[PDB]
Amino acid sequence: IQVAHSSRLANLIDYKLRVLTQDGRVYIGQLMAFDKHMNLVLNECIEERVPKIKVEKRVLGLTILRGEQILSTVVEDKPL
Amino acid sequence: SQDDEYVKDWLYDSRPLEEDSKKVNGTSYKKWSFDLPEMSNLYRLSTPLRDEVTDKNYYYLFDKKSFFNGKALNNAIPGGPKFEPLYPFNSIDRVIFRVPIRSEYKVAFPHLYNSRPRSVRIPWYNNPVSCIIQNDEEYDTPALFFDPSLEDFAPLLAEEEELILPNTKDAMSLYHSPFPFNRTKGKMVRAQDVALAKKWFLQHPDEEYPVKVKVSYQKLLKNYVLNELHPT
Amino acid sequence: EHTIFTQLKKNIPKTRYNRDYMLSMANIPERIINVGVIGPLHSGKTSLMDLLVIDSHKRIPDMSKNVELGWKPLRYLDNLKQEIDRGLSIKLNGSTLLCTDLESKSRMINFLDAPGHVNFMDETAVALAASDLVLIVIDVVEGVTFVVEQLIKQSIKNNVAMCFVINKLDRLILDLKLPPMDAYLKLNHIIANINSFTKGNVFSPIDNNIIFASTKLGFTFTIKEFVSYYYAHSIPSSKIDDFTTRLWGSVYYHKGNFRTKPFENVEKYPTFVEFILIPLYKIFSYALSMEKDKLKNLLRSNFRVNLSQEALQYDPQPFLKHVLQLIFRQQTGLVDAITRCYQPFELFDNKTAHLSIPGKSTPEGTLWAHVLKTVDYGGAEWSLVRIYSGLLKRGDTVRILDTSQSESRQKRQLDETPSCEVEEIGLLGGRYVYPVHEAHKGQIVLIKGISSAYIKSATLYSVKSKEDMKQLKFFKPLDYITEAVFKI
Amino acid sequence: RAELEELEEFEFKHGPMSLINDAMVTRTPVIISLRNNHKIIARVKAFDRHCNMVLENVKELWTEKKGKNVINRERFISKLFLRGDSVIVVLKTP
Amino acid sequence: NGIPVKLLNEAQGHIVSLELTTGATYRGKLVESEDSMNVQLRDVIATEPQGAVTHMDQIFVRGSQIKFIVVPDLLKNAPLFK
Amino acid sequence: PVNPKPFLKGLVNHRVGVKLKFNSTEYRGTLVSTDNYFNLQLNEAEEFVAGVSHGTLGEIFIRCNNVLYIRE
Amino acid sequence: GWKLALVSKKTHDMIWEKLRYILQTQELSSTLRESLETLFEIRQKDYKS
Amino acid sequence: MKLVNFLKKLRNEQVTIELKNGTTVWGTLQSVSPQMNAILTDVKLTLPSDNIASLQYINIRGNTIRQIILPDSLNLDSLLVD
Amino acid sequence: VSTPELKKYMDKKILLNINGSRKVAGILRGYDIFLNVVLDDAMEINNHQLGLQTVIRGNSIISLEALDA
Amino acid sequence: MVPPINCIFNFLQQQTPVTIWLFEQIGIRIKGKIVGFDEFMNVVIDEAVEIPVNSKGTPLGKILLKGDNITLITS
Numbered sequence A: 001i002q003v004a005h006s007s008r009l010a011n012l013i014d015y016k017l018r019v020l021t022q023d024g025r026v027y028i029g030q031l032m033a034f035d036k037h038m039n040l041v042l043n044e045c046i047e048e049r050v051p052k053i054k055v056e057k058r059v060l061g062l063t064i065l066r067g068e069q070i071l072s073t074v075v076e077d078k079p080l
Numbered sequence B: 001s002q003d004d005e006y007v008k009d010w011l012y013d014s015r016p017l018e019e020d021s022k023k024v025n026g027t028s029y030k031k032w033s034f035d036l037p038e039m040s041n042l043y044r045l046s047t048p049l050r051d052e053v054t055d056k057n058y059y060y061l062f063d064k065k066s067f068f069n070g071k072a073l074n075n076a077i078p079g080g081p082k083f084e085p086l087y088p089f090n091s092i093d094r095v096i097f098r099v100p101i102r103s104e105y106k107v108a109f110p111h112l113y114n115s116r117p118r119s120v121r122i123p124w125y126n127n128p129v130s131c132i133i134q135n136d137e138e139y140d141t142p143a144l145f146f147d148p149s150l151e152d153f154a155p156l157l158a159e160e161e162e163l164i165l166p167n168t169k170d171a172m173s174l175y176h177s178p179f180p181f182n183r184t185k186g187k188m189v190r191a192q193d194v195a196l197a198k199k200w201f202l203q204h205p206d207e208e209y210p211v212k213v214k215v216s217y218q219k220l221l222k223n224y225v226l227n228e229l230h231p232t
Numbered sequence C: 001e002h003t004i005f006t007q008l009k010k011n012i013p014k015t016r017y018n019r020d021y022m023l024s025m026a027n028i029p030e031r032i033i034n035v036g037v038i039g040p041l042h043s044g045k046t047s048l049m050d051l052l053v054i055d056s057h058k059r060i061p062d063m064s065k066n067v068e069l070g071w072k073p074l075r076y077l078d079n080l081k082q083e084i085d086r087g088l089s090i091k092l093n094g095s096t097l098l099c100t101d102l103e104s105k106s107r108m109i110n111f112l113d114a115p116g117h118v119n120f121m122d123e124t125a126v127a128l129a130a131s132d133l134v135l136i137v138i139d140v141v142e143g144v145t146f147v148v149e150q151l152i153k154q155s156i157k158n159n160v161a162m163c164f165v166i167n168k169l170d171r172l173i174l175d176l177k178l179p180p181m182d183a184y185l186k187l188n189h190i191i192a193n194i195n196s197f198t199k200g201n202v203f204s205p206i207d208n209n210i211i212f213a214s215t216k217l218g219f220t221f222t223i224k225e226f227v228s229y230y231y232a233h234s235i236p237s238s239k240i241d242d243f244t245t246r247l248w249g250s251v252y253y254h255k256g257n258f259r260t261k262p263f264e265n266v267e268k269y270p271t272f273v274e275f276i277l278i279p280l281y282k283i284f285s286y287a288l289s290m291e292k293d294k295l296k297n298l299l300r301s302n303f304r305v306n307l308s309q310e311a312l313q314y315d316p317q318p319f320l321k322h323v324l325q326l327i328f329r330q331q332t333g334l335v336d337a338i339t340r341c342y343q344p345f346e347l348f349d350n351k352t353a354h355l356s357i358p359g360k361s362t363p364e365g366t367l368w369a370h371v372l373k374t375v376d377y378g379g380a381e382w383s384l385v386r387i388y389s390g391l392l393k394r395g396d397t398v399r400i401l402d403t404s405q406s407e408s409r410q411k412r413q414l415d416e417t418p419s420c421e422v423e424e425i426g427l428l429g430g431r432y433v434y435p436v437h438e439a440h441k442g443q444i445v446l447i448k449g450i451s452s453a454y455i456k457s458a459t460l461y462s463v464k465s466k467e468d469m470k471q472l473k474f475f476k477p478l479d480y481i482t483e484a485v486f487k488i
Numbered sequence D: 001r002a003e004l005e006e007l008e009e010f011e012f013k014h015g016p017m018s019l020i021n022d023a024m025v026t027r028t029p030v031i032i033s034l035r036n037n038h039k040i041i042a043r044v045k046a047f048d049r050h051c052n053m054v055l056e057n058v059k060e061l062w063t064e065k066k067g068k069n070v071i072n073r074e075r076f077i078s079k080l081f082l083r084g085d086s087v088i089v090v091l092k093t094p
Numbered sequence E: 001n002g003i004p005v006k007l008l009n010e011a012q013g014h015i016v017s018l019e020l021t022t023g024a025t026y027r028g029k030l031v032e033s034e035d036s037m038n039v040q041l042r043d044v045i046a047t048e049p050q051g052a053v054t055h056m057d058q059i060f061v062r063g064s065q066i067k068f069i070v071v072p073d074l075l076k077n078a079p080l081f082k
Numbered sequence F: 001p002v003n004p005k006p007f008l009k010g011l012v013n014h015r016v017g018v019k020l021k022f023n024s025t026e027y028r029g030t031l032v033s034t035d036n037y038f039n040l041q042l043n044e045a046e047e048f049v050a051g052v053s054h055g056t057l058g059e060i061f062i063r064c065n066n067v068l069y070i071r072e
Numbered sequence G: 001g002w003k004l005a006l007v008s009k010k011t012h013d014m015i016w017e018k019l020r021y022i023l024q025t026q027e028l029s030s031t032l033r034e035s036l037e038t039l040f041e042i043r044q045k046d047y048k049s
Numbered sequence H: 001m002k003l004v005n006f007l008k009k010l011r012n013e014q015v016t017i018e019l020k021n022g023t024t025v026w027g028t029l030q031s032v033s034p035q036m037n038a039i040l041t042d043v044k045l046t047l048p049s050d051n052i053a054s055l056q057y058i059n060i061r062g063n064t065i066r067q068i069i070l071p072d073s074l075n076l077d078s079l080l081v082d
Numbered sequence I: 001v002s003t004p005e006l007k008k009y010m011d012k013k014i015l016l017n018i019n020g021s022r023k024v025a026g027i028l029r030g031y032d033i034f035l036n037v038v039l040d041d042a043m044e045i046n047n048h049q050l051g052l053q054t055v056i057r058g059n060s061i062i063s064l065e066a067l068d069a
Numbered sequence J: 001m002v003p004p005i006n007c008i009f010n011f012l013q014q015q016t017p018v019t020i021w022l023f024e025q026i027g028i029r030i031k032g033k034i035v036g037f038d039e040f041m042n043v044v045i046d047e048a049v050e051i052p053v054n055s056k057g058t059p060l061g062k063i064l065l066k067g068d069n070i071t072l073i074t075s
């Protein structure tokens, strides 16, 4: 995996981002919009739960992720 | 060198501005772009020849369209031109001559009051103009009319105490002016191409000139309409 | 080719947003406002419409150089040869515009720039019948004359939401050259008049009912809009509402950081004057008189506005217009005013009842629509139809009833004999019929095949059951407010 | 902003925020119970409104308990930042 | 103002899905939204965390409980972004 | 008239018993002072683990967010 | 009034200003209001008679 | 009075971190937000008896951050004063 | 400041989902900005009523469902 | 219409049989009568009683309970 040594989150917007969630799932997709409260809008969001064995996988598309239920953000891949 | 403080130096030149590289295009002398106050000066100076009629309504049943209509029906508006005719039920028993149906109407609503119209244009129709002009030595005042019955921050454009600048009294006037002075930039035209005289006879004849002068006016309008009418 | 003109082409001027999105939005009601802008002769309503359209679209062909500059008004919604040459809006040449509100939301509006001249009020009546909100528009100068009052009465009697536009401020600032307090007073007088006429709801800049426009210079604002733009930096998030409420309605800032309701010792003017009107005055006064560099600096500082280097070399009117555009970013505040005003959709019932009859079992899924008026919008015969329930698809058969046969039909009910196809559908957009297959509920579209099925102002329907048909009702003939008594 | 910080330090000295402020002034080791069960013996360096507190001389005490094998575990850290919400009860050891 | 909350309120009317902290998904027409995501729906299927579906006419939700909201592919187009 | 905050101001310099939510325990010590946040401080606070004094903690400072109820 | 305009114009203007200020921002008597209105109407011509 | 001042003043330091669940995080302090959001480049994670999961870049939510183990060469009193 | 528009649901029975899978039936009496539901108490989840008039806290609300249309 | 502030002002003056449920808590309830009210939802309760849930009358007195962890009230 490769990414630029970025200063802040908004500078790397529209990047394929692995986004953890407090309930155990991880949402992977290119981020369109962020917030002061860390609400995120993934362009091609993909629902990936970790069941109690192997990864659960599901496609969502354009979705809002609420900020409170986020654990953290990670860059998965580049734009385009 | 006080009222006419800017133009005075150059108003009488062969080419008004040979250099003045900011104010004109250059020495080719193709385009120009004056600042405000000099434009104001020009306007003031032009008081004798300037169009001097802001109320666009004024040319009512006196536009080129109106003239054309008059032509097309032989319903000459008496202040204006009268042409060679364009061409070579309804009984007294029937109709009721309550309104004596005038020629002025026959061009106003040409398709309605004038039956059997041919080659007839449609004129304008308009809103009432209340451009109140100021006389002198003041600004922003109701004069000609009556009045109605009844966390540490300042508002916008703070530290701009004077509402009106010394030029805005004149700028407003300029803004209301017609096409010559209206604007603060233009392309040149040939002295030839400027019509200092058209604006007098296109607008209405002032007051009680001798018949001959009235005739002259009419003649001029007849020419003008013809020129307008056969686009070359 | 033809003289009495529209677009008649594949390449309709491209929009900033995309029309696919607009049509998608138009799938659901509660997101299609039918505005039907109204007012006296030369209110500026058509000019307002033009402003909106221009704001919406990228580059129009008809938007020539001069109109762009702002010498001539781009009267985009007087498509008829006559309506140009005559200088009057004469028929309904509305537009479908995906309009952004001040708060972030995207609603497709069906505007209808109706005529103002009082002989044409017939045409206007249709707009009232059509539209669920009405942007009444008023000239400041003439104020509310009788015509405006009449219009208001009609709207209230026709059960339609109202959201006023006090238009042509440029006149009172430049033509009349009123002092700012005087201007404020005038405004108060006007709004007072409005309130007097409208016995029910009380209109004001607060609550975002009134809209302060100048379509020649090309700017509208609600106070909410303006405040949002230029009094969000200064004052905090929560106290903004209070500020908004204060601005208008005789409260004086008092040189101090929390105003008094009564008189103040130091300054003279109200908050509305000090915090809006005075700024406008400053703009106008400076956008003519002020040495351009200084003006540029001020714009940079206070408004956060960058003048184009071309705009520096504009003529003083068009320059001013450009500046105004830069200041009041869009016709967004106006849209906010509309949406906020027409947040009641319980009025829909009242409207429908008023038009046809008080009834129910209408949302069974039977498509039915008020055929408003036959128009000649692309030259050809079109029928402007407002759909209420269901959705109409292209190449569908439909029952149609001329509202001559409406009362009679009603009487007879307490055998769908007339019928016709729908050859094509499209959307009015000032100068083009933009073709669309869908024609969803709660909106206005143009259809080919209806026209010849009726004379004026029909209803349509397409029941899937005789029982359903029994449950139906039919619109009354549109009582065109003016009676025609000029016999030729 | 300055008047709020003045009443902050004023309200600390008089209110119960004075205790661990005085513990920082005396600079003693203090035990702190935690949300995920960690008795933190440490020297308090920093102190704010929210009870976020940088800790010198850190010594966390807990029990990683799984497999019927009580393994009371503990570690030393040089310096550590504490978040407020984790704290349950701070106490100054005599 | 929150540009994701901007999107939510712009998404009103479409068939949107919604899972909470509880893990119980929903799906139907949205009706209302605010700064705090005080969501309302119509025609909403209400699948419990086990998978037990219960169709119902309407629902109102509090924003604190919301986890994520499935928006359609239309809001990808326009007009909130640019 | 007997509100919480004035009774709490009367409860200053008096014995109090603190109960909490998760991984929690009753207490018993003389309240020292309070604020608008309801951050507590006790002297001679005894750690009553479900009403059983596990240890005399003494001079302590309890956080506001984990407070459930406070009694005599 | 016309005479006032003629020579002592500043005061006349001032008088107008005060009058208007009174006119609209006041709990003013109705007959008085009508008189004022009449005054302004005549002002529009500035005493023809 | 704000430790946010100090945490803002902590820049380009390689630090360990704990979370609400208790996950370790070894990475350079790229920046810290006024609400504790630890922007970190060149990061390495290890869960709470579990094996390594190293990564390129992680900005973690402020509230999820439990306890940041600071580096060795660190004068606390130098940054605390203005 | 944004008032949750419960005037559509005012004076109607509502199935309030609250913390720990608990349900509350009851006709609505009023509310506030925090969503604290003032409601006439009804049977709590076979089924049994506690109280006559109740006020539920907003933080404890999971959801509130339209029982009445 | 009755906001929670006004309904609790009825509970304040009345002091009628209140039953309280608790936040993040199913195992225990309370039974008393409302005596206080804060600007927050903090309320002091006299004659309060700890009442474990019907899956007895256990001892409890007068309590200032931190009101941010409330669920039910009903006087």
Ligand SMILES: Nc1nc2c(ncn2[C@@H]2O[C@H](COP(=O)(O)OP(=O)(O)OP(=O)(O)O)[C@@H](O)[C@H]2O)c(=O)[nH]1
Pocket (backbone or CB within 6 Å): B127, C040, C041, C042, C043, C044, C045, C046, C047, C048, C073, C075, C087, C088, C089, C090, C114, C115, C116, C117, C167, C168, C169, C170, C171, C213, C214, C215, C216, C217, C218
């Ligand atoms: N001074 C000034 N004039 C304006 C303004 N807006 C419009 N006008 C003028 O008045 C006319 C009113 O606008 P239009 O759109 O042309 O008229 P309209 O609204 O179509 O009137 P109807 O045909 O009755 O609908 C324009 O033709 C302009 O010349 C303004 O803001 N200031």
